[PDB]
């Protein structure tokens, strides 16, 4: 299928600091996705062994972006990535042979991070057996210790309703935090850094723009900040003005969020 | 003769019986699982009991037994019923049952389909409250061959302190004894940790005969 | 054949009143054959490890499964449970084949109360296989003497199913209550748990003794681990005292 190809995460992306207004929460995960990489030898000198990770669950907001993140601030070697949607199909069976060729690949890359995202696909137990196999195999796969007990576990889904994965989560899992949506000051660093493009005028107040745009996503904020300089040189122009797509921003989250 | 029911409302002593000739001779060794009949799925495996059905009349020799009856014989009830009228067709049916035997057991003599205990289909019926004591001597004396005991022995304390029993709760109880003589690390067992603790983990046995 | 119940798991090895009994009930009727043949004692097979939650049955037989240091076989309650069909000779008949011809092994299952039904309401239920599944189980150990090798140990996390027919050797046996034991107990095996970190040299064990009621052993690991993983960022090597309440009162 499509995620033996697309399964490999490549060409790095959005970085650390475009966070959705998580300020302790970026801590909460950084410790587990960058902090064990920057220093290993802490942790088991320090302690016992590095810490397993976090979940982010709830409201979708900016999710499925800051895993990408985490692929693009990589260090060493830009993990690999792995969805749910393509493990419910027709022909069921391929799922077995698809876990234990990916954790294969896991144990080629000296045990790399392997991150499990849209749980919601195969969860939710409450004619099924088909997806016990795969969610129970899984399962399976990832709190048994055999491959690897140490080196990541992250679920970020948009449902709660997985009663499986909610009682044996607490075997391997940890870290019941919910996604801690954005707040409204929180788009201020979105656009300090997103200011490294084209000369952009200092007149353009980040806090002003950060605080005209309520409920947006990253995505949406990452499509005002591709529309700003796309308005800004269809004008034929070399400098980028809020005078000159207030209008467009005000109108694409007002007209579009009506 | 064509059947007969085994109904011991206290304790066992059907599948004492029922595996001592069973495992002695059984004329065959092929054991019906009384439970296994409709299906789990859609009930089309008619062709699963006239198939089972019919190796018991391809084989000429044939014994079946049916142990815990109790369950199954209480538009899901419709089928049931449905399978019940079969078998009162495949029983008193056209086919003389004059060389297969059928051996019905239960747990419970409340709820055996009085419809069913209608003369004919379970004829012999046979108490298992007191054994006349027969199983409980003999399975103590063949019990009793191997572990060695001092030379006070006084087998009437056992046998008659001891009522409403089996073999195997007697065997139970017999070496629940001889491991509480186990852990004191001593080569004889004198009678008296069989008074004793078979009088006390037997009447255990009573309060926890549920 | 059927390699989601012949090959279930590959693995070689993983409350004294009840750990006791129990330890020296799967231990001595291993090697201790001599004794067993000069006082004709059988060897108990079955055992019913029941009693009220907040135990942790699972990775206490666990740990006695570590104590006898043989090989380990897991299998859960619902796995049972198949779609198929003719699951009981060939599931029975296949792990009682690889147990039968393998090495002595330990098998340790829990949830029997649930798939042991004997359906007291008749108006519909497909629990009818798996009784049939309990029917060649109680066959297979009742009628064949030859049963003498591999033991089958069950688990019940209730016993408001019990089936009357279930005394004898073979079958469950060792009824074992759980009369729910001082918590200086519970702080006696998680302190063996817990001793390879680097400690504190002061712990009175009261506070966070009296602090862990009807949890399970594993929610005692998860109190350790929980605290290994702050302790981690704590900045301090060693592991403090209030981390133990601090994390009972955090995950608990």
Redesign the interface.
């Known amino acids: 299928p499509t995620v033996t190809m697309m399964q490999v995460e490549e060409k790095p992306d959005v970085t650390y600091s475009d966070v959705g207004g998580c300020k302790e929460q970026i801590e909460k995960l950084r410790e587990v996705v960058e902090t064990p990489l920057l220093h290993p030898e802490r942790f088991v000198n320090l302690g016992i062994e590095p810490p397993k990770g976090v979940l982010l669950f709830g409201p979708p907001g900016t999710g499925k972006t800051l895993c990408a993140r985490a692929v693009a601030n990589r260090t060493d070697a830009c993990f690999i990535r792995v969805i749910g949607s393509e493990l419910v199909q027709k022909y069921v069976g391929e799922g077995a042979r698809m876990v234990r060729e990916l954790f294969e690949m896991a144990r080629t890359k000296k045990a790399c991070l392997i991150f499990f995202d849209e749980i919601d696909a195969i969860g939710g137990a409450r004619g099924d057996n088909e997806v016990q196999r795969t969610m129970l195999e899984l399962i399976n796969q990832l709190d048994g210790f055999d491959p690897r007990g140490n080196i990541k576990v992250l679920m970020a889904t948009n449902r709660p309703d997985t009663l499986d994965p909610a009682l044996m989560r607490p075997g391997r899992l940890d870290r019941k935090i919910e996604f801690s949506l954005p707040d409204l000051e929180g788009r201020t660093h979105i656009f300090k850094i997103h200011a490294r493009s084209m000369s952009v005028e200092r007149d353009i107040r980040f806090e002003l723009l950060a605080r005209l745009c309520p409920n947006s996503t990253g995505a949406e904020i990452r499509s005002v900040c591709t529309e700003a300089g796309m308005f800004a040189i269809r004008a034929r122009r070399k400098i980028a003005t809020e005078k000159d797509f207030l209008e467009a921003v005000n109108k694409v989250i007002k007209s579009y969020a009506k | 003769p064509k059947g007969c029911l085994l109904y011991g409302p206290p304790?066992?002593g059907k599948?004492l019986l029922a595996?001592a000739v069973?495992?002695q001779l059984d004329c065959n060794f092929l054991?019906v699982?009384?439970?296994?009949?409709?299906?789990?799925?859609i009930g089309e495996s008619a062709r699963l009991i006239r198939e089972m059905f019919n190796y018991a009349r391809d084989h000429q020799p044939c014994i079946i037994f049916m142990?815990?009856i109790d369950?199954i014989g209480?538009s899901?009830?419709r089928e049931?019923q449905r399978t019940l009228m079969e078998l009162l067709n495949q029983m008193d049916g056209f086919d003389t049952l004059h060389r297969v035997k059928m051996i019905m057991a239960t747990?419970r003599p409340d709820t055996l389909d009085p419809a069913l205990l209608r003369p004919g289909r379970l004829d012999r019926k046979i108490h298992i409250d007191l054994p006349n004591e027969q199983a409980r001597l003999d399975i103590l004396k063949i019990?009793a061959?191997?572990?060695?005991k001092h030379g006070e022995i006084d087998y009437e304390a056992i046998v008659k302190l001891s009522d409403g029993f089996?073999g195997?709760?007697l065997?139970?109880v017999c070496?629940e004894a001889?491991?509480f003589a186990?852990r004191a690390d001593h080569d004889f067992?004198v009678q008296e940790d069989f008074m004793k603790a078979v009088r006390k983990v037997a009447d255990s046995k009573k309060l926890?005969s549920? | 054949y059927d390699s989601r119940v012949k090959a279930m798991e590959v693995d070689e090895r993983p409350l004294d009143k009840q750990i006791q009994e129990l330890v020296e009930a799967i231990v001595l009727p291993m090697n201790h054959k001599e004794?067993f043949?000069?006082?004709?004692?059988?060897p108990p097979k079955g055992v019913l490890m029941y009693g009220p939650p907040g135990t942790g049955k699972t990775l206490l037989a666990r740990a006695c499964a570590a104590q006898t240091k043989a090989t380990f076989l897991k299998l859960a309650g619902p796995q049972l449970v198949q779609?198929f069909?003719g699951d009981?000779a060939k599931l029975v008949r296949d792990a009682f084949a690889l147990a039968k011809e393998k090495a002595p092994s330990i098998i340790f299952i829990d949830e029997l109360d649930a798939i042991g039904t004997?359906?007291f309401d008749?108006?519909?239920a497909?629990d009818?296989?798996v009784?049939?599944t309990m029917?060649?189980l109680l066959?297979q150990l009742?009628?064949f003497?030859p049963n003498t090798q591999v033991k089958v140990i069950a688990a019940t996390n209730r016993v408001d199913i019990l089936d009357?027919?279930l005394?004898?050797?073979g079958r469950l046996?060792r009824?074992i209550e759980f009369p729910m034991p001082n918590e200086e107990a519970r702080a006696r095996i998680m302190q063996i748990h817990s001793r390879k970190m680097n400690v504190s040299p002061d712990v009175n064990y009261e506070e966070l003794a009296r602090c862990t009621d009807d949890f399970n052993g594993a929610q005692c690991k998860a109190v350790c681990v929980e605290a290994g993983m702050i302790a981690l960022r704590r900045g301090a090597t060693e592991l403090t005292h209030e981390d133990y309440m601090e994390g009972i009162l955090e995950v608990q």
């Open positions: 304790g066992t599948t595996r069973a495992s054991k699982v009384s439970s296994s009949i409709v299906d789990k799925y142990d815990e369950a209480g899901a009830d049931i747990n019990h061959g191997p572990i060695t089996n195997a709760d065997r139970n070496t001889g491991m186990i067992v926890e549920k | 004794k043949e000069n006082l004709g004692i059988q779609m069909i009981g004997k359906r008749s108006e519909k497909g009818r296989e009784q049939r029917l060649e066959n009742d009628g003497q009357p027919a005394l004898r050797s046996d009824k």
